[PDB]
Amino acid sequence: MNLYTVIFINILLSLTLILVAFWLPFSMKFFLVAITFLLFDLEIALLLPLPWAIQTIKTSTMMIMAFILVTILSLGLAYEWTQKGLEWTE
Amino acid sequence: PGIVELPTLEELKVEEVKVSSAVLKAAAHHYGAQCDKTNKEFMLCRWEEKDPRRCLKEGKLVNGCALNFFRQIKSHCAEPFTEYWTCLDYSNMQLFRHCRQQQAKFDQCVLDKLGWVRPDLGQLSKVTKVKTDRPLPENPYHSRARPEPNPVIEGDLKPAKHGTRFFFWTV
Amino acid sequence: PFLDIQKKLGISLDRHFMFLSAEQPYKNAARCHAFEKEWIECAHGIGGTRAKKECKIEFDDFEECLLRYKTMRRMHDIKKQREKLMKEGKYTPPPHHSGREEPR
Amino acid sequence: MNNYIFVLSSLFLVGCLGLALKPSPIYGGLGLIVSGFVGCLMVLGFGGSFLGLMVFLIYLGGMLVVFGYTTAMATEEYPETWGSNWLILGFLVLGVIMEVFLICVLNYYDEVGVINLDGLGDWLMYEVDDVGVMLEGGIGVAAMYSCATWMMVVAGWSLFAGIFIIIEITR
Amino acid sequence: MNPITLAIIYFTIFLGPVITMSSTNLMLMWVGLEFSLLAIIPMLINKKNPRSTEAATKYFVTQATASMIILLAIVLNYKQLGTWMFQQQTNGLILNMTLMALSMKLGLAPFHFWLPEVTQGIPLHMGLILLTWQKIAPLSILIQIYPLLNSTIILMLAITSIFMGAWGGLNQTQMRKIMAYSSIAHMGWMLAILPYNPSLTLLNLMIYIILTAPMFMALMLNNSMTINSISLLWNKTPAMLTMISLMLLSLGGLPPLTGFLPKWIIITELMKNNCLIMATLMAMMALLNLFFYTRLIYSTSLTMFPTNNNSKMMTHQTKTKPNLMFSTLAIMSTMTLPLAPQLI
Amino acid sequence: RMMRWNQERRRLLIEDLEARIALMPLFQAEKDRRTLQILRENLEEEAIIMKDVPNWKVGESVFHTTRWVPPLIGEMYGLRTKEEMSNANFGFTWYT
Amino acid sequence: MFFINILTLLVPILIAMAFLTLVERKILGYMQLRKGPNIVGPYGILQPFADAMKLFMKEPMRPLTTSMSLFIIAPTLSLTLALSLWVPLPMPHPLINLNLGILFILATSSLSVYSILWSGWASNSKYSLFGALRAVAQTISYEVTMAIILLSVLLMNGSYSLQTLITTQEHMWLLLPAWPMAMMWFISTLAETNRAPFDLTEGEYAAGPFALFFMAEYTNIILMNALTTIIFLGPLYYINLPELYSTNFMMEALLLSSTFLWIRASYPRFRYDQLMHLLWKNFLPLTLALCMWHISLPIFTAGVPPYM
Amino acid sequence: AGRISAFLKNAWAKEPVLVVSFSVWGLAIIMPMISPYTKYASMINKATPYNYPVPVRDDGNMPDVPSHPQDPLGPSLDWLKNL
Amino acid sequence: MPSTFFNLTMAFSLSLLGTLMFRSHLMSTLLCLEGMVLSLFIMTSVTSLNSNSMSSMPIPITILVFAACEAAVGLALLVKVSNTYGTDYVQNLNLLQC
Numbered sequence A: 001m002n003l004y005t006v007i008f009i010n011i012l013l014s015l016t017l018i019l020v021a022f023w024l025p026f027s028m029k030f031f032l033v034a035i036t037f038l039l040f041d042l043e044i045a046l047l048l049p050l051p052w053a054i055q056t057i058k059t060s061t062m063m064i065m066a067f068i069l070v071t072i073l074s075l076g077l078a079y080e081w082t083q084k085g086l087e088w089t090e
Numbered sequence B: 001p002g003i004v005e006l007p008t009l010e011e012l013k014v015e016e017v018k019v020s021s022a023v024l025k026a027a028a029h030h031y032g033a034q035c036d037k038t039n040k041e042f043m044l045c046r047w048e049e050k051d052p053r054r055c056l057k058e059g060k061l062v063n064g065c066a067l068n069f070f071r072q073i074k075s076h077c078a079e080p081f082t083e084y085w086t087c088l089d090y091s092n093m094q095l096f097r098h099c100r101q102q103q104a105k106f107d108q109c110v111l112d113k114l115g116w117v118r119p120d121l122g123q124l125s126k127v128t129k130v131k132t133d134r135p136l137p138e139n140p141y142h143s144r145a146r147p148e149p150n151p152v153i154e155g156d157l158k159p160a161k162h163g164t165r166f167f168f169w170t171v
Numbered sequence C: 001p002f003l004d005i006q007k008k009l010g011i012s013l014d015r016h017f018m019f020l021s022a023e024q025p026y027k028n029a030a031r032c033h034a035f036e037k038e039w040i041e042c043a044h045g046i047g048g049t050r051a052k053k054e055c056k057i058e059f060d061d062f063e064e065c066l067l068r069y070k071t072m073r074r075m076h077d078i079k080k081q082r083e084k085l086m087k088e089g090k091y092t093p094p095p096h097h098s099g100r101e102e103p104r
Numbered sequence D: 001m002n003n004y005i006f007v008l009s010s011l012f013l014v015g016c017l018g019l020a021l022k023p024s025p026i027y028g029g030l031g032l033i034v035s036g037f038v039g040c041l042m043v044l045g046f047g048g049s050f051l052g053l054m055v056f057l058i059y060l061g062g063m064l065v066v067f068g069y070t071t072a073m074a075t076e077e078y079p080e081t082w083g084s085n086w087l088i089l090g091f092l093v094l095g096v097i098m099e100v101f102l103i104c105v106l107n108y109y110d111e112v113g114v115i116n117l118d119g120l121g122d123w124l125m126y127e128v129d130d131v132g133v134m135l136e137g138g139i140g141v142a143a144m145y146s147c148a149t150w151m152m153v154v155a156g157w158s159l160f161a162g163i164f165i166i167i168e169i170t171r
Numbered sequence E: 001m002n003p004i005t006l007a008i009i010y011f012t013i014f015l016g017p018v019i020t021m022s023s024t025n026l027m028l029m030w031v032g033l034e035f036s037l038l039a040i041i042p043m044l045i046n047k048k049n050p051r052s053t054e055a056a057t058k059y060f061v062t063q064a065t066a067s068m069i070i071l072l073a074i075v076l077n078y079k080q081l082g083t084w085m086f087q088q089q090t091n092g093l094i095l096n097m098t099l100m101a102l103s104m105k106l107g108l109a110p111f112h113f114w115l116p117e118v119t120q121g122i123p124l125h126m127g128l129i130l131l132t133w134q135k136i137a138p139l140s141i142l143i144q145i146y147p148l149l150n151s152t153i154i155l156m157l158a159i160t161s162i163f164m165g166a167w168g169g170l171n172q173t174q175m176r177k178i179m180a181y182s183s184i185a186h187m188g189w190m191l192a193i194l195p196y197n198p199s200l201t202l203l204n205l206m207i208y209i210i211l212t213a214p215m216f217m218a219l220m221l222n223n224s225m226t227i228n229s230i231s232l233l234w235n236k237t238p239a240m241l242t243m244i245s246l247m248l249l250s251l252g253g254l255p256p257l258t259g260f261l262p263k264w265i266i267i268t269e270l271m272k273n274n275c276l277i278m279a280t281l282m283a284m285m286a287l288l289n290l291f292f293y294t295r296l297i298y299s300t301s302l303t304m305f306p307t308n309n310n311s312k313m314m315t316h317q318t319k320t321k322p323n324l325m326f327s328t329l330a331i332m333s334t335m336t337l338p339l340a341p342q343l344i
Numbered sequence F: 001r002m003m004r005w006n007q008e009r010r011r012l013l014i015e016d017l018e019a020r021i022a023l024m025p026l027f028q029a030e031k032d033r034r035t036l037q038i039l040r041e042n043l044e045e046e047a048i049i050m051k052d053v054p055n056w057k058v059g060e061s062v063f064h065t066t067r068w069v070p071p072l073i074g075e076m077y078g079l080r081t082k083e084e085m086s087n088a089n090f091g092f093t094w095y096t
Numbered sequence G: 001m002f003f004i005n006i007l008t009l010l011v012p013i014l015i016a017m018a019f020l021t022l023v024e025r026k027i028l029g030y031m032q033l034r035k036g037p038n039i040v041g042p043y044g045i046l047q048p049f050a051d052a053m054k055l056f057m058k059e060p061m062r063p064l065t066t067s068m069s070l071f072i073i074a075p076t077l078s079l080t081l082a083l084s085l086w087v088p089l090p091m092p093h094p095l096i097n098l099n100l101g102i103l104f105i106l107a108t109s110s111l112s113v114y115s116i117l118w119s120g121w122a123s124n125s126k127y128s129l130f131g132a133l134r135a136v137a138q139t140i141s142y143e144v145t146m147a148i149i150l151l152s153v154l155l156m157n158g159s160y161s162l163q164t165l166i167t168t169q170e171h172m173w174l175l176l177p178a179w180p181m182a183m184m185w186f187i188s189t190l191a192e193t194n195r196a197p198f199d200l201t202e203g204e205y206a207a208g209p210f211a212l213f214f215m216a217e218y219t220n221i222i223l224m225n226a227l228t229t230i231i232f233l234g235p236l237y238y239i240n241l242p243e244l245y246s247t248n249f250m251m252e253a254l255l256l257s258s259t260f261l262w263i264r265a266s267y268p269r270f271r272y273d274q275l276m277h278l279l280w281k282n283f284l285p286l287t288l289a290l291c292m293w294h295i296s297l298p299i300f301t302a303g304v305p306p307y308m
Numbered sequence H: 001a002g003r004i005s006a007f008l009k010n011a012w013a014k015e016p017v018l019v020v021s022f023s024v025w026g027l028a029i030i031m032p033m034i035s036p037y038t039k040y041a042s043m044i045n046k047a048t049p050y051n052y053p054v055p056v057r058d059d060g061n062m063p064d065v066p067s068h069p070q071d072p073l074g075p076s077l078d079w080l081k082n083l
Numbered sequence I: 001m002p003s004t005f006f007n008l009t010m011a012f013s014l015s016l017l018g019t020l021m022f023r024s025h026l027m028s029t030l031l032c033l034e035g036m037v038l039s040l041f042i043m044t045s046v047t048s049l050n051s052n053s054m055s056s057m058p059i060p061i062t063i064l065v066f067a068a069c070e071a072a073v074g075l076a077l078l079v080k081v082s083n084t085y086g087t088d089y090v091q092n093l094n095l096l097q098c
């Protein structure tokens, strides 16, 4: 109930301020950026549960899989780099 | 179908402890050594026989042997324990890290006026063997009997009688 | 499956977390563990045509413990009769249902 | 608060209805954002802290963002769409009312069936370990690293190959 | 397209169906389907022309909707039984939605309208894959659940597919649309026999693949995407007629040729199951496929069409295209009836 | 320093979990008695609430198993107060 | 009592932003060899109120080709997020004690792109849309490291909670370790807040909306510096002295917020292309490398932290 | 040796960031095999009691399992303290 | 559970209806597809949390990843369509009818 109260309060305050305000008187580069950001945000999604995965017993396995993730992500980055995907010189 | 079976209200009626979390936590490490047998017996009943309605005779003994512990504590050495759990209840996670010297007071007092030593790290978190007259339950899941598997054919293999018998294909 | 290379190499990529009676991380039990265990153990070895008819009591138990339609209906019938009685003035709730008692 | 999850699911329904009706690729994005907010809220209601916050941080912050991005950079708003927008807003109103009547008829036809309006606040949580630690959703989503590594390699490979796929499509 | 990109995309194209067929979890099956889609789109769009882009868009939309419906079916089964596999207790509506989705993934009628357009807009080596390798995972998912399907809708889909394939191939003058409708027809036969015997679905699948691959290779020999272009084959490469004609007759399903056996044995099983009326309809309507294959055999091998001049220089030039698989598969597909008891 | 600090943190966590261990039995028995009394109250009420209905066995299980089936919180707090129901469902997910 | 707590939380942060404006002006002046405001009130403490009155008393010339909906809900959203971020912060005890609190911060920070983009799509032009696209791309790109840094530093404390970092730094700051992760975190706070040298979006709104945007900006500034203080500069926590913790937290947050303005006065601007090269070629490699390093550290050391 | 070392110096001058990234990658993949303190991680995360230790019956033949938490017949993690 | 699941299924059906009924755009179809994705994610997570089956939580994660990839390739195709014709309209893809 408390979170609801706080957010409602903030919204009310914002709308009140903005009411008083009135009542007183194509390039593919950006698309490629968005796509790269998708492919890294999903990696964040696959990477966030490490604070719970590092509590397990299969440490030799979590080590492995996390290294796989990071390594192949770096390789994809390097390839997008070599292929001039981070240049901006139209 | 099948009338469920429950126990009456006269029973499952016992003198509860009415004592609070900080108190049970300040007294746990000693309550885990003392009053351990009658606790393991109950935590074996409740797991072998999956029904709780078949371990009330043991839960009552748990409550009794816990009240006896908290009564020994009151008879002898009440003030160190009182201050210890009052200091514990201040925190939110009820942590043992801040109340370390009042804990030493409680421990010395109990070790002098009684014979309780504090379990060392890891001693309570093991799997002990418990003994009792109670028998092990056969069919605890009420495992309805299994069927019979399809009778398996068996016999030395021999080639096909006249081949594939596909239209007019001799072999 | 269609190509039992998994069973060929005697490994497990996808066939250890299929159903509820499987292994959970910290031994945490699932809801219908026992019912599903019984259904599987009783249908093992007679697969399909037989298990759909001579292993049906256990499937009914699993269905009920997972979907709970019958329990819902029971509680709803009870509450409907109780509402009718209260409306007509032939029954009053007790204290522990009304909201006051001595708790444990 | 018995009506909480029902209200949330109804708002999700209305958002997906405002999707089905196609005002424009930008108000559709706003509808998607609202529906996702509500989806996270209901997941948290059912106890999915990690799942809901992940929805927040990835679906909205990562997916609808690039949706609106590509929309603005590769779409033009044409003047006709405004009258039709008002028209489909009226359509949305009519659909809301039709859904209300639908739910009424379904309650009349199946009391304890489709929806138990009498048991609305109930049948949300069926069971929970009261004295149990280590039963959140991260404990499961982190299985991937010890058990179900196959799913992790699958997903990582999808993401890996997506790089090459997109560079070859755009080029 | 560089070697690394080629390798990644084709490894994904190969891995998709392999996961689908080697996984017990419907989620992993769905994963394989998504892999296939993701990795196929770029090859379709390689040329970067309006037609290829349109084909890619149509393919993507259709397959994505289908995948979503399949995943809905899986989620519903999961809520219903707690397990990630279809059993003998799933609400038949789940399985019928799944069948609709798989049929749209394959290209069956009346979920077929996208296949000829896409194949036309697409090149040859891509139609080959789209019509041979992209039929194996969605068919496997069905083979795994054949005991618990609805013969009614299956037979309706199959017969509709036969009919529309015939009535499309009768009109189309383009090699690729003709191949599309032939695929529709043979997949209809497969679905028809599926719930009674899937070994015969697989038989007809392999037969159709062995029959289609070498035909697309024949075409790619001269990139003859049209009847009036393949008619010049008598002057360009006449050593291919003796085999194009036989493979087309086999496709049609003429007795003395491999392509017959599928229809024959499928009709046999349907008769054992008392599906004689459907078998009769199908057997009578396959003759139109045979008709518009004979109409091509004519323009290719039994009569010479008006040729051109620069074909002289085309004769001057040599060639090294048709690898050994052409001959191997064409022979295996035309002269393997004496071995039917083994293929059964 | 972080290593040497987190190891002591681990020891402290083990201590707290050991306290939990030593306590659990008491809690399990108390909880069993509580839920049994809840079900008994609900049954003793249903007995007279549903006396005049035709063909209603009072205490009729929906199973053919004969073994214990943990009840749902709906089953328990269905005849009790809506605030109790809300405390059961949205009580821990609502920040103390 | 809870509403009173909410007031005590909200009013002071708004006052602090309004006076951080003045502090910025005075510091920049004294670094430019001048005074800054001295007149309106003693040392200028009335100038922010004067400016607020002026703005809110102006007349809004709302662009005619626009959409009132996206015109009003953009600054509303900005301020709502900028205020709801301050909620979980342990200072030392939090108003709302959340687990996954830093994740809530990540999400409620990433949600501002929607406003910074709707404003542009509303303003019917092409230059404003260009600027909005570029700013969105910048913010997006830097969110990646803003997330990975925390993902790697939250393995010295095995929990996504902010009330665990206090005991994690009960003996030593998380700066000595991860000072290479901070230097990359201290900057993504500038680029995320479009703060110089990353102000390629303010170097087109009425009085009230501009004021709300200003408020959001400076609130986010204070909050990012507060997060830095709590994470990498864990202050003192004696169980009986939340007063001490709060004093130290305030001091460090003011140090950091003054450092931001130090920088604004000290350095030139960047060029969008070079700004993106910075991340995608210097920060992401090092970030992933140190992520692997910090995944391995708690293993080849026996110092893997707990889950309480 | 000379050519590759000159290459590495050229790098160390031109792009030290790439060098540092790759070297941290190598350290991460290598040190967990050198270190002796690795095993202890699995040892601890096993030693953590997130569950109840369900006991067993004293059926006579089980001498290496204790009847009380304070007996030395069972495991004892004094190595954790000594750590 | 029953009510929220009924409403989630109705929402999926509505979004599929939107897909199968075009309205001259293509973004308005990709958004319906993503709404479907979201509904399925929610239903799966809700069933997992209801059954307490922590051995099935990776499934939402996987489907989210793959839906993201699908959306990415769809957006790329839409971008090409716009780059060529000038609009994300569907009457312009009238080719291949010959």
Ligand SMILES: CCCCCCCCCCCCCCCCCC(=O)OC[C@H](COP(=O)([O-])OCC(O)COP(=O)([O-])OC[C@@H](COC(=O)CCCCCCCCCCCCCCCCC)OC(=O)CCCCCCCCCCCCCCCCC)OC(=O)CCCCCCCCCCCCCCCCC
Binding pocket: B168, B169, B170, B171, E246, E256, E334, E335, E336, E337, E338, E339
């Ligand atoms: C120009 C290009 C054209 C080239 C292609 C020409 C066509 C090919 C030949 C004719 C067609 C194929 C004939 C079928 C072969 C049978 C194989 C089989 O699977 O079943 C056998 C198997 C047993 O056969 P069988 O009748 O019991 O014989 C028992 C033995 O006689 C009893 O003794 P045994 O069982 O102990 O066997 C001992 C063994 C010992 O012999 C040896 O080992 C010596 C090997 C030396 C071989 C060299 C001689 C080659 C002679 C052929 C010449 C061809 C010219 C090309 C070569 C040039 C040479 C310079 O005998 C053999 O090796 C037999 C060799 C097989 C090939 C020759 C055929 C003789 C077999 C008898 C069947 C005769 C055909 C009737 C089919 C009925 C059709 C309805 O199953 C059968 O019962 C027969 C079923 C076959 C029915 C086929 C149905 C389709 C027919 C439609 C025609 C379509 C044909 C494809 C053409 C497509 C056109 C586009």
Ligand SMILES: CCCCCCCCCCCCCCCCCC(=O)OC[C@H](COP(=O)(O)OCCN)OC(=O)CCCCCCCCCCCCCCCCC
Binding pocket: E234, E238, E239, E240, E241, E242, E243, E245, E246, E256, E301
């Ligand atoms: C036994 C049981 C019976 C079972 C049923 C049997 C089914 C019936 C068998 C049908 C077999 C043939 C069917 C396909 C007909 C092919 C038509 C054909 O190839 O002839 C047309 C073409 C003429 O070419 P043109 O330009 O006019 O001048 C000659 C230059 N080659 O010809 C060509 O150009 C051919 C290519 C020239 C290559 C050089 C010549 C080498 C020989 C090639 C032809 C081989 C045919 C084998 C016939 C065996 C018959 C069994």
Ligand SMILES: CCCCCCCCCCCCCCCCCC(=O)OC[C@H](COP(=O)(O)OCCN)OC(=O)CCCCCCCCCCCCCCCCC
Binding pocket: A001, A003, A004, A007, A008, A011, D034, D037, D041, D044, D045, D049, D050, D053, F092, F093, F094, F095, F096, G073, G076, G077, G080, G081, G084, G097, G098, G099, G100, G104, G108
């Ligand atoms: C017209 C202008 C429009 C602009 C509007 C902009 C508003 C955006 C404001 C920022 C959004 C904040 C997002 C809130 C997510 C909450 C996530 C969270 O952590 O709450 C989980 C909470 C605690 O759970 P947990 O931490 O996991 O463990 C607790 C056990 N002790 O457990 C809970 O689930 C608590 C109950 C959930 C409360 C969430 C309510 C959030 C505020 C609702 C906003 C409503 C706005 C109007 C409707 C939006 C459009 C439809």
